[PDB]
Amino acid sequence: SNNVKPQVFNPDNVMMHEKKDGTLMNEFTTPILQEVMENSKIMQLGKYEPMEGTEKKFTFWADKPGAYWVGEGQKIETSKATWVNATMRAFKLGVILPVTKEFLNYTYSQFFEEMKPMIAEAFYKKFDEAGILNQGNNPFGKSIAQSIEKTNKVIKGDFTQDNIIDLEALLEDDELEANAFISKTQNRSLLRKIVDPETKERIYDRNSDSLDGLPVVNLKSSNLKRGELITGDFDKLIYGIPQLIEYKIDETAQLSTVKNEDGTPVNLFEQDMVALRATMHVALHIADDKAFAKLVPA
Amino acid sequence: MEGTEKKFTFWADKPGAYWVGEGQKIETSKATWVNATMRAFKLGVILPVTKEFLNYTYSQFFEEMKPMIAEAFYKKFDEAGILNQGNNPFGKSIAQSIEKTNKVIKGDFTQDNIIDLEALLEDDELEANAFISKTQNRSLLRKIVDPETKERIYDRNSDSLDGLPVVNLKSSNLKRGELITGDFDKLIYGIPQLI
Amino acid sequence: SNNVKPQVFNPDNVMMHEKKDGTLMNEFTTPILQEVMENSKIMQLGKYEP
Amino acid sequence: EYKIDETAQLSTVKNEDGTPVNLFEQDMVALRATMHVALHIADDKAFAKLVPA
């Protein structure tokens, strides 16, 4: 054939040195980032739990023995202890980034080293929005938002010291104490304008991002609406990581998920291409479905 | 700037990620970047003088006019880039961007409206940095009071509103009822040639 | 997609860590052979030829 | 001889939709074993058999 025009791909996920209009992309000015990389908020709030396999077992006390009053020479009676069990399993995150090897020579030599940070953020966000918000095809049967929905442990109404005290009070009604708040940064407008009419002191630190003395953590997600606030005992949210992010770089595989213009699968050896594969195994457990409560606009 | 134009490359998309079953196919995703560019324009004026005037009437005229020419340029630049006035040459200004994104409040000066006006930036994960004001707003700004605590948000001692600096335009185009908020690290200015 | 249930295969010769009912095979015990493996009878009886 | 491979395609095993199994996309491993072996019968008369009627 000796067809020298560049290859069209579907989807257009391949990075390329040459465009189909004939533009050839030398002297490329390396992009810069208007942002800082986000952490996992679950790895921030929750409790880490070492986990060697893809599954883990927990056992807890449930009943404690009694005692009796006995007269001299009366028969002493018996009593019984009891325990209960819980379990969590892991799921796998992954992505592939394909590159034409001209691109990696004549346009952006460092490309994969600059993607490695940006891949981690993508995994962390996928994990947080599953485990906090029940979003993004949550693989676990478990989340904060789903715990709240099964307990119906929800407050309705406006951000007020009235409703914010009631929100935390809803946890000690189950003999738990709140440890943090989850909110959407859009809504510190509302927290900034509530004050006690009696003592005339404000509940929210604009300076420290503390609400009612507890720390506030902000989600970047769009799924948590402005009027909504969540609180809980986050030591009851347990996570594990059987496999820290592993990267493989591959110069010879076939990618079936990207197709050539003629419909053939992309072959990395035969078409002179490279790809990066990242995978991570991550596990989530809500230790107590009652430990979380939500305030919602009516 | 090292010439009359500047150019910037910024990342525009992060790569996705997928939940993958046991032995299921992993899917692909891409990064992306976007380009922006900034160009200069020229300001100028000429001041003609009769030689008799410069000899007999006012010898230092040009040395003393230089400061006033400089001020005339700054007031032309500001009125083009803050407002959209003075037959603005550039593609866009703040008042252009506010009409396009429609981040405007209709209302009187109240603590609620001053807080909502900043909340219009928190909508988009941006934090307000300063205010731009008419100086004849000070009659309105000083009578804003918190009804519970009776705190006043305009610090008379520091020309500071809600703890943010206010900066005053001295132009006829910004009306007695109007106030502007932003993150001014997003204004970029360059000067290829000083006066 | 984000489809998390395990991959079905045909002929189904692939070894997998989890079953389609969701049983993850953690804490698995290494099998032990019931008989003992057979040698080649040809290699026992025949003449070798380098 | 044993060769272990982490990236090749297998064509003889197919996914639920009928696609071949790509070991790289699907995060898999395969062991290939091969051997060469040869046979000769120096005299075909040297063997005899008893068979039921």
Show the 3-state SS of chain B: CCCCEEEEEEEEECCCCEEECCCCCCCECCCEEEEEEEECCCCCCCCCCCHHHHHHHCCCHHHHHHHHHHHHHHHHHHHHHCCCCCCCCCCCCHHHHHHHHCCCCCCCCCHHHHHHHHHHHHCCCCCCCEEEEEHHHHHHHCCCECCCCCCECEECCCCEECCEEEEEECCCCCCCCCEEEECHHHCCCCCCCCC
Q: Quick check: C17 and B18 CB within 8 A?
A: no
Chain C nearest CA to D17, separation (Å): 9
Would you call C4 an interface residue with chain B, using a CB distance cutoff of 8 Å? yes
Q: Quick check: A255 and D22 CB within 8 A?
A: yes
What are the chain A neighbours of B188 within 8 Å (beta carbons)? none
Between CA A25 and CA A107 the distance in angstroms is 7
What are the chain D neighbours of A274 within 8 Å (beta carbons)? none
Would you call B24 an interface residue with chain C, using a CB distance cutoff of 8 Å? yes
Write down the residue that tokens 């981690």 correspond to: A120
> What technique determined this structure?
cryo-EM
- What are B82's two structure tokens? 């803050």
Q: How far is CA B194 from the centre of its chain?
A: 21
- What are A238's two structure tokens? 């347990």
Write down the residue that tokens 């921030």 correspond to: A44
Q: Quick check: B26 and D28 CB within 8 A?
A: no
Would you call C24 an interface residue with chain A, using a CB distance cutoff of 8 Å? yes
Chains sharing 3 or more CB pairs under 8 A with chain C? A, B, D
Between CA B50 and CA A124 the distance in angstroms is 74
Q: What is the resolution of this structure in A?
A: 3.2
Q: Which secondary-structure segment (H or E) carries A162? A: helix A161-172
Write down the residue that tokens 């909110």 correspond to: A183
Between CA D19 and CA B149 the distance in angstroms is 70
Q: For residue B114, which phi and psi values (nearest 5 degrees)? A: -65, -35
Q: Quick check: B23 and C4 CB within 8 A?
A: no
How many contacts (CB atoms, under 8 Å) link A and C?
Answer: 16
Q: CA angle, corner B120, sides to B91 and B175, nearest 5?
A: 65
Q: Quick check: C4 and A53 CB within 8 A?
A: no
Write down the residue that tokens 């050839």 correspond to: A24
Between CA B177 and CA B124 the distance in angstroms is 25
Residue in A174, A122, A146 with CA at minimum distance from that of residue A237? A146
Q: Quick check: C24 and A89 CB within 8 A?
A: yes
CA atoms within 13 A on the CB side of C34: 0
Between CA C16 and CA B195 the distance in angstroms is 75
